[PDB]
A paper describes a structure:
Recently, two group A flavoprotein monooxygenases (FPMOs) (GrhO5 and GrhO6) and a flavoprotein oxidase (GrhO1) were shown to mediate the drastic remodeling of the 3 backbone and subsequent spiroketal pharmacophore formation. First, GrhO5 generates a ‐spiroketal moiety as part of the advanced intermediate dihydrolenticulone (4), which entails the rupture of three C−C bonds and a CO2 elimination step. The functional homolog RubL from rubromycin biosynthesis was shown to catalyze the same reaction sequence, pointing toward a universal strategy for spiroketal formation in the rubromycin family. In this work, the combined crystal structures of GrhO5 and RubL suggest three interconvertible catalytically relevant conformers, hereafter referred to as the “acceptor state” (FADox in OUT; accepts substrate, no reaction with NADPH), “reducible state” (FADox in OUT with bound substrate; reducible by NADPH) and the “catalytic state” (FADred in IN with bound substrate; reacts with O2 for hydroxylation).
Hence, crystallization screens under high‐salt concentrations were conducted, in which only RubL crystals formed in presence of shunt product 7 that diffracted to a resolution of 1.6 Å. Indeed, a Cl− was found coordinated between the C4a‐position of the FAD cofactor and the protein backbone including P316 (distance of 3.5–4 Å from the proline carbonyl to Cl−), which is conserved in the majority of group A FPMOs. Notably, although the active site was partially occupied, clear electron density for the shunt‐product was not observed. However, the FAD cofactor shifted and adopts the “IN”‐conformation, which is stabilized by several hydrogen‐bonds formed between the heteroatoms of the isoalloxazine ring and the protein backbone as well as amino acid side chains. Strikingly, several active site residues have a different rotameric state compared to native and 3‐soaked GrhO5 with F287 and W289 now stabilizing the FAD conformation by direct T‐shaped (W289 to FAD) and indirect (F287 to W289) π‐π interactions. At the same time, rotation of these amino acid side‐chains results in the opening of the NADPH‐entry site, which may be beneficial for the efficient release of NADP+. Notably, co‐crystallization of RubL with 7 apparently also caused a loop ordering (residues 90–110), which resulted in the closure of the substrate entry site and a more confined reaction chamber. Overall, these changes lead to the catalytic state of the enzyme. The observed Cl− adjacent to the FAD cofactor indicates this site, which is likely optimized to trap the transient superoxide long enough to allow spin inversion and collapse of the radicals to the FADC4aOOH (step IV). In this process, the backbone carbonyl group of the highly conserved proline of group A FPMOs (P316 in RubL) may function as an H‐bond acceptor to stabilize and position the FADC4aOOH intermediate to ensure regiospecific hydroxylation.
Numbering used by the authors: 9 to 548
The structure:
Amino acid sequence: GPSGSAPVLIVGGSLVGLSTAVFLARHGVRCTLVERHPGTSVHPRAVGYYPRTGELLRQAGVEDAAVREASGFATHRTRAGVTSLAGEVLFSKEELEGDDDLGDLTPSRLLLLPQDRLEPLLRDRAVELGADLRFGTELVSFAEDPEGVTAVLDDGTGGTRTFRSSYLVACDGPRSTVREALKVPRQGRGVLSRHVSIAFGADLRPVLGDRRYSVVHVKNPQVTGILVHDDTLTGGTLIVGYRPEDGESLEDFTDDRCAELVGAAVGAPGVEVTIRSRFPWDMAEQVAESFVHGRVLLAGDAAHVVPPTGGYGANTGIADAHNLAWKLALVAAGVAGPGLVETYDAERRPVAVYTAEQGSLQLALRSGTATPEQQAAVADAVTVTSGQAYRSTAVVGEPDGADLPVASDPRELRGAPGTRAPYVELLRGGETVSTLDLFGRDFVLLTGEHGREWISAAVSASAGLGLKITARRVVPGTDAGAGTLADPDGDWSERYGGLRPEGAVLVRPDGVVAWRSPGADPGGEESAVLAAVLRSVLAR
Ligand SMILES: Cc1cc2nc3c(=O)[nH]c(=O)nc-3n(C[C@H](O)[C@H](O)[C@H](O)COP(=O)(O)OP(=O)(O)OC[C@H]3O[C@@H](n4cnc5c(N)ncnc54)[C@H](O)[C@@H]3O)c2cc1C
Ligand SMILES: O=C(O)[C@@H]1C[C@@H](O)CN1
Ligand SMILES: OCCCC[C@H](O)CO
Ligand SMILES: OCCCC[C@H](O)CO
Ligand SMILES: OCCCC[C@H](O)CO
Ligand SMILES: [Cl-]
């Protein structure tokens, strides 16, 4: 029998599915999420979230909560190699070199928060916004027809139930039920190496003393691996490899064998070790050839598995959720055509390919197997995560505008179409407001001081297309009043690419520039031009 319907069914309740639920619910889209596990993750995989992801958590309403939960990890500022935690230090450096001078580009910083503490924050936020989260519930099969998707659900309580949606968003991980049902092929290097993550309890306070590490590379004759200690210094995760080609297998990782390895990594006799969880995983590079299959969308690790060297995977998946959610909201609202959904593939798949390659390059670099060309190809994590340029029907390039790389120095992009609309602190009323805090719900049009023709065009297009558009003139200095944003520094038009006083920029709900005009329309047809821009972007 039926167990309901909703515009969107989300499969998977890890970071990408929970993020999808939050962003859809924030746009007022009713969704149901199914997660086979009885609750959120027991074994944390992700720990590091780059500043763009911090900006996306702020849009989600959970960044401040995450930063408060992470306050113990805030001191873990050093990456190190050691023989053991008790033993000799082999190298020591900063975890993210210039985390300290990001302030010109973003108000966020590197966030270190284990995944098992971030997921509950997203879960509680999704529930507050009205998402229907069904844990202990597995998607078994589905079928698409011209009007929707019918899913078969198993909550273990005997019999299966059907669910009917308009869209199915597969956030169901590297072995995606949905991707495999659809027989979507994946490209890339495939499986490179086999690993186990060993979550452990051990009192490390006497061994670490006052030292606090982000990540520790351990190398001694008994164990080679990565240790990440927790904020209370009473446990962590030891990540090791094994080689089936040498007769090693997962079966080898008994509790006793895991405790031996953790003890060897800690290096202090008499340290009592508790094994909390053993998480097997493969180091892999595999990207789906397409992320949109009619009414079925692939997001996160269902769409792309990247080598975890560089910590890009959850960052990339949360940005996928953020890209798709506003698009499904506008299609479900009847304000956009279904072509807008296809742009999820056009925009996120090339990022996924680039990011998967970056993970692979980091792995080559750390493995000492990197050619001089592969070394030169490694990008800054802020370039990978903040420097993206989209090409799709939801981006309208300037006539003179040139084709941008998939990712490049974010400091140079200066609000080009398809890139992140820059962070500028402006004034509204008596408050400071970030450009970033204007974005996340509606289209936003920001104009120069003399941009009233573009403002008028936004008011007209809003009525004509049934679309809310926030439109403001940005006025340099502090001599500004109601209906404007003040730009005390006079930085805004330069940071947005040298917009003239009559110029304008149109920002999508995801904070990506859709379109800009340096000045007035040459033909004085601002109203017709902005309407045509929005019709193209909205696939109508
Ligand atoms: C050791 C390690 C370290 C990492 N460190 C970082 C890091 O620091 N930063 C970072 O950004 N990323 C990191 N990553 C990557 C990150 O963990 C993943 O990219 C991320 O978890 C993917 O999220 P997801 O929601 O797409 O998939 P998953 O986390 O794989 O979750 C998928 C969910 O779907 C559920 N599911 C599957 N099939 C079904 C079904 N049929 N019905 C219902 N539910 C289903 C599963 O139970 C699971 O809970 C790391 C990964 C590893 C392995
Ligand atoms: O669920 C289990 O079987 C164990 C219990 C805890 O140690 C975490 N994992
Ligand atoms: O570096 C420690 C990894 C050992 C793997 C294990 O020995 C498989 O049998
Ligand atoms: O408890 C240590 C923090 C979590 C680390 C994570 O498990 C690494 O994948
Ligand atoms: O003099 C300070 C100006 C405040 C700006 C105004 O509130 C624009 O919205
Ligand atoms: Cl990763």
